[PDB]
């Protein structure tokens, strides 16, 4: 994907309409089951791939 700052062909409605073509919630939300009990969480969790960094400050 393309995340250039000042692009304006990119917005959130456009991404959302794409997302909804793959069988996901248009807003990126999902329906999580709780790992302990197995019961659905009553809130729809926002979930998706994000780039994370490990910083040098290890404990």
């Amino acid at each position: 994907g393309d995340a250039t700052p000042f692009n304006d062909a990119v917005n959130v409605q456009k991404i959302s309409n794409l997302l909804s073509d793959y069988g996901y919630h248009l807003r990126g939300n999902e329906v999580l089951y709780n790992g302990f009990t197995g019961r659905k969480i009553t809130s729809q969790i926002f979930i998706g791939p994000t780039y994370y960094q490990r910083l040098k400050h290890m404990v």
């Binding site: 909804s20 069988g23 996901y24 919630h25 248009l26 807003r27 329906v31 089951y33 790992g35 009990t37 197995g38 019961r39 659905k40 969480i41 009553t42 809130s43 729809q44």
Partner: protein
């Protein structure tokens, strides 16, 4: 005051994944089985690596770590082995391990794809997944670089290290239509339909069902190749049943000894 009486319905059965339906059971039972598929079914995996010669571009533990994550064909053998910590042997036994061996030297000019092909087992059954599609790349060697190690595989389960988890991904689901309202949609029509949804394309979620339990748990157990996807299930049921039997034993001791 007693148990419910569940029914099973296999929907899809391949050599890679299982789709099954469990009916007439508690939400807790249906999820605890999911936990056990992930973390408490035993498999065989590399867990001891003795590195004799390593001249590759990677570290020493990088090699060893990657060897750990390679799945090994476990079905016939894993319910026979001792856990390593339980074998009487002073080192390792064929009753408590399977021995592996990697000896690779790049002599030629082209680069060497160190693959799972190179892992030579002493047991013919507990091999890497090669039987019947490429092979797990371990390293890449250059002209003059080599790798000699011997390795041992032991029994373990995903509660220790992810390496012993037999599954790709367990797809648990219940109540495809929002009949229990376990989840509360702000806009229930923005939501795509479940795979399992017994609903038309008109309405968004099922009407509210006040008095009603979860049943019909939808599973999709996907094997990493270390077991058949249907053996993961029989093993987990047997694992959970065994934890409870053990628990009961310990309980009975506690009761009579008070």
């Amino acid at each position: 005051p007693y148990a419910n009486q569940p029914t099973v319905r296999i929907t899809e059965l391949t050599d890679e994944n299982v789709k099954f339906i469990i009916e007439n059971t508690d939400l807790a039972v249906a999820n605890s089985i999911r936990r056990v598929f992930i973390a408490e079914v035993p498999i065989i995996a590399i867990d001891w690596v003795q590195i004799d010669a390593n001249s590759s571009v990677l570290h020493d533990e990088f090699i060893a770590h990657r060897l750990g994550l390679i799945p090994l064909t476990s079905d016939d053998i894993v319910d026979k082995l001792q856990y390593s910590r339980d074998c009487t042997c002073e080192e390792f036994c064929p009753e408590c391990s399977v021995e592996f061996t990697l000896d690779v030297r790049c002599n030629e000019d082209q680069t060497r794809h160190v693959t799972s092909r190179d892992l030579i087992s002493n047991s013919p059954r507990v091999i890497p997944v090669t039987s019947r599609q490429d092979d797990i790349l371990i390293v890449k060697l250059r002209k003059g670089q080599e790798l000699r190690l011997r390795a041992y595989a032991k029994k373990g389960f995903g509660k220790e290290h992810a390496k012993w988890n037999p599954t790709a991904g367990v797809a648990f689901e219940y109540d495809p239509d929002n009949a229990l309202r376990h989840t509360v949609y702000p806009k229930p029509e923005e939501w795509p339909k479940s795979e399992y949804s017994e609903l038309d394309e008109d309405e968004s979620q099922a009407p509210y069902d006040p008095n009603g339990k979860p049943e019909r748990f939808y599973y999709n157990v996907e094997s990493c190749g270390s077991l058949r996807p249907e053996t993961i299930v029989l093993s987990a049921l047997s694992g959970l049943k065994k934890k409870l039997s053990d628990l009961q034993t310990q309980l009975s001791h506690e009761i009579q000894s008070d």
